[PDB]
């Protein structure tokens, strides 16, 4: 029993973290094979006006880099721009490089953050990509370059490298192709997070988890059609539900169909009335159907 | 900025997980040096564990690290654990200690199945000596740990789930948290209360992150609050010196936060704090200080 936002074990990723320093900048990089990827902000000088990164790279001195894995220092062979990242060729292969892929995540999907400082992992936690392409992380100074990942079949899927914090304190990364999530700029200038909506399919996953865990007080006897719900959703800060295939297993396990949960969501969106569901006092969209199924049934 | 319940990185513990099978039972063990620790439940069919051990055949154990099987040399009872001596040293054994956690303290759970880590998450020991974990069948023997300056402190091995679905483990000395029994007989969890010193730490994190809507202008003395706490599902406040730096940084004293807690209890759920339930008690003062300041 239980539902917790959990991370996949971080060991295989820990071995890939490096410290990347240039001048007065210090952040984290990801060392895979003979390449280190890090945010290009490390070569910026520095704030608070628009950075010409191409110029910064053109005047770079390779020897001014300090890149290390614990005590092992890496020689820099070459540097190339990769969107919002530097792709740094180093003189050594990371012998502990896991089997890996890159994949850009989409809003509503979950992944793991390995928060790193000074080139060493400090903490690991799960997140879910919001509809405005930000995550609610926890990062302080030095965290840039912390990776996000999923693990499938022992293959590590890297999907995020930490880039910046917005004025409201939420967090934006790029994918490993160097494409910033949400199109935010890796510039010191003013940027505000876009509007966000609760991912209804994730909220549904959470309520199914609640039912599996014996929380049923909030459950409606009423129903509402997906069509009717979707009309209400867009005036009420939640996403539309298009397909319900992802709920077949959970509906079968519980005997509760999506339509009853949608009615429940409507009454729980305003108010939990002083009660809790699995410890929550407000609807959460941080869990996906896949997470819930894996967590309840393996 | 931000506040998240995190786990310390699990890599150093992952290489210590083994699968331990006996008869029809399979669970997880912790392999350190030439010893494997696991819940004694694995040799059970009320249970007389001394009897079960007296008839046990060593060759009936199957202990594996990945596809490598370890030879069993001997077995000794250790409270609710077995200490199993094996014929090989774990060459990836970290520097480690054992320490029993106390209510209100945080640690990390590495949830394991079939002798392999599957998930990692932070927990906090509740006032009734249970944790709010997530574990399904096969999780027994999953370890709890903290990492303190290069040393792994092992503090928990998973033992059982109660009717309410909260979780009980033993320490690595084999002493069951809360005194619950490793028996199939039905047991119910003791009453639990929110850990107030942790709620205080959380509210300080909130202030540091610019959340102030809930902040009372009133004050209540610690001991008078404590009298109220014990009738309102909250623990007493005993330690206050730990809040000194947080009070200094925010300009808010504990007495003001205690009055805020009373008010939050009165419109419970009316608004989130940093996206959490307002009376969140899973973060300790140390956790908060580390996430705010490093």
Q: Among the CATH numbers 3.20.20.140, 2.40.10.10, 2.70.70.10, 3.40.50.1000, which is that of A99-196?
A: 2.40.10.10
Chain B residues in contact with chain A using a Cβ-Cβ cutoff of 8 Å: 1-12, 14-15, 110-111, 113, 117-121, 132-136, 138, 161, 165-167, 209-210, 268-269, 272, 275, 277-278, 291-294
Q: Rounded to whole angstroms, how far apart are CA atoms A238 and A265?
A: 10
Count of CB pairs separated by less than 8 Å, A with B: 134
In chain B, the largest separation of any two C-alpha atoms, in whole Å, equals 68
Q: Which of A14, A296, A297 sits opposite B9 (nearest CB)?
A: A14
**Chain mean position to CA B114:** 21
Q: Which of B3, B165, B294 sits opposite A2 (nearest CB)?
A: B165
Q: Rounded to whole angstroms, how far apart are CA atoms A39 and A32?
A: 15
Per the CB < 8 Å rule, is A10 touching B10? yes
Q: In chain B, which residues have their Cβ closer than 8 Å to the Cβ of A124? A: 6-10, 120
Per the CB < 8 Å rule, is A8 touching B293? no
Q: Which of B23, B119, B138, B190 is catalytic?
A: B138
B212 and B205 Cβ atoms separated by less than 8 Å: no
| Cα angle, residue B283 at apex, residues B280 and B286 outer, rounded to 5° | 150
Distance from CA of A11 to the nearest CA of B (A): 4
Residue A237 CB coordination number (10 Å): 12
SS3 of chain A: helix, strand, coil, percent, to 5:
25, 30, 45
CATH of domain A197-298: 1.10.1840.10
CB under 8 Å to A85, separation ≥6 — which residues? A37, A38, A39, A40, A161, A174, A176, A178
Q: In chain A, which residues have their Cβ closer than 8 Å to the Cβ of B6? A: 115, 123-125, 138
Q: Rounded to whole angstroms, how far apart are CA atoms A154 and B11?
A: 14
Q: In what order do the strands lie in the sheet with A35-39?
A: A72-74, A65-69, A17-22, A25-32, A35-39, A85-90, A76-82
- Tell which residue, A133, A7, A10, has the closest CA to residue B4: A7
Q: In chain B, which residues have their Cβ closer than 8 Å to the Cβ of A2? A: 132-135, 165-167
- Cross-strand partners of B109: B121, B144
| Cα angle, residue B201 at apex, residues B195 and B207 outer, rounded to 5° | 135
Q: In chain B, which residues have their Cβ closer than 8 Å to the Cβ of A116? A: none
The residues spanned by each domain of chain B are 1-94, 95-192, 193-294
Tell me which DSSP letter residue A212 carries.
Answer: H
Q: To one decimal place, what's the resolution in Å?
A: 1.6
Cis status of the peptide bond prior to A46, with omega within 30 of 0: yes
Tell me which DSSP letter residue B67 carries.
Answer: T
CATH architecture designation of domain B95-192: Beta Barrel (2.40)
CB under 8 Å to A95, separation ≥6 — which residues? none
Helices (runs of H) and strands (runs of E) counted in chain B: 7, 13
B60 and B22 Cβ atoms separated by less than 8 Å: yes
Residue A164: helix, strand or coil by DSSP?
strand
- Tell which residue, B82, B141, B290, B263, has the closest CA to residue B201: B290
Per the CB < 8 Å rule, is A138 touching B10? no
Concatenating the DSSP letter of every residue in B193-217 gives: -B-HHHHHHHHHHHHHTT--TT--S
B47-50, long-range: CB < 8 A, 24+ apart: B47/B182, B47/B183, B47/B184, B49/B77, B49/B182, B50/B77
Q: In the CATH hierarchy, which fold is given to the domain comprising A1-98?
A: Thrombin, subunit H (2.40.10)
Q: In chain B, which residues have their Cβ closer than 8 Å to the Cβ of A276? A: 269, 277
Pick from B2, B165, B233 the residue to mutate for testing the A interface (most A CBs within 10 Å): B2
Q: Among all residues of chain A, which has the CA nearest to that of B15?
A: A11
Asked how this structure was determined, the answer is: X-ray
Whether the domain at B95-192 and the domain at B193-294 fall into the same CATH topology? no
A152-158, long-range: CB < 8 A, 24+ apart: A154/A12, A154/A98, A154/A99, A155/A98, A155/A99, A155/A100, A155/A101, A156/A12, A156/A13, A156/A98, A156/A99, A156/A100, A156/A101, A157/A100, A157/A101, A157/A102, A157/A103, A158/A30, A158/A100, A158/A101, A158/A102, A158/A103
N- to C-terminal Cα separation, chain B: 12
Tell me which DSSP letter residue A178 carries.
Answer: S
Q: Burial level of B39, CB count in 10 A (0-12/13-18/19+)?
A: buried
Our answer to whether residue B242 is catalytic in this structure is no
Q: Rounded to whole angstroms, how far apart are CA atoms A13 and A148?
A: 10
CATH 1.10.1840.10 fits B193-294, yes or no: yes
Q: Rounded to whole angstroms, how far apart are CA atoms B181 and B184?
A: 8
Per the CB < 8 Å rule, is B1 touching A138? yes
In chain A, the largest separation of any two C-alpha atoms, in whole Å, equals 69
Q: Which of A38, A116, A144, A246 is catalytic?
A: A144
Distance from CA of B1 to the nearest CA of A (A): 6
Q: Which of B14, B121, B167 sits opposite A6 (nearest CB)?
A: B121
CB under 8 Å to B201, separation ≥6 — which residues? B243, B246, B283, B284, B285, B287, B288
- Cross-strand partners of A112: A126, A149
CB under 8 Å to A282, separation ≥6 — which residues? A272, B269, B272, B275
Q: Which helix (H) or strand (E) holds A88?
A: strand A85-90
Our answer to whether residue A144 is catalytic in this structure is yes
CATH 2.40.10.10 fits B1-94, yes or no: yes
Q: B173: number of CA atoms within 13 Å, CB side?
A: 8
């Amino acid at each position: 029993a239980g539902l917790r936002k959990m991370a996949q074990p971080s060991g295989v990723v820990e071995k890939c973290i490096v410290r990347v320093c240039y001048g007065n900048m210090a952040l984290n990089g990801l060392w895979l094979g003979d390449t280190v990827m890090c945010p290009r902000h490390v070569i910026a000088s520095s704030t608070t006006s628009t950075i010409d990164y191409d110029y910064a790279l053109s005047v770079l001195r390779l020897h001014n880099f300090s890149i290390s894995s614990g005590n092992v220092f890496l020689g820099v062979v070459g540097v190339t721009m990769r969107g919002a990242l530097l792709q740094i060729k180093v003189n050594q292969n990371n012998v502990h490089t896991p089997k890996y892929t890159y994949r850009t995540v989409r809003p509503g999907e979950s992944f793991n953050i390995l928060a790193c400082y000074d080139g060493a992992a400090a903490g690991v936690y799960g997140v879910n990509m919001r509809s405005n392409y930000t995550i609610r992380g926890s990062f302080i100074n030095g965290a840039c370059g912390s990776p996000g990942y999923n693990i499938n079949n022992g293959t590590v899927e890297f999907c995020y490298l930490h880039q910046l914090e917005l004025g409201s304190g939420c967090h934006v990364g790029s994918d490993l192709d160097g494409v910033m999530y949400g199109g935010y700029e890796d510039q010191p200038t003013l940027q505000v997070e876009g509007a966000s909506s609760l991912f209804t399919e994730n909220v549904l996953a959470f309520l199914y988890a609640a039912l599996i865990n014996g929380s049923t007080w909030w459950l409606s006897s009423s129903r509402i059609a997906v069509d009717r719900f979707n009309e209400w959703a867009v005036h009420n800060g939640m996403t539309t539900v298009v397909n319900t295939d992802c709920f077949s297993i959970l509906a079968a396990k519980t005997g509760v169909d999506v339509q009853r949960l949608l009615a429940s969501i409507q009454s729980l969106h305003k108010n939990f009335g002083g009660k809790q569901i699995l410890g929550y006092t407000s609807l959460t969209d941080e869990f996906t159907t896949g997470e819930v199924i894996r967590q309840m049934y393996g």
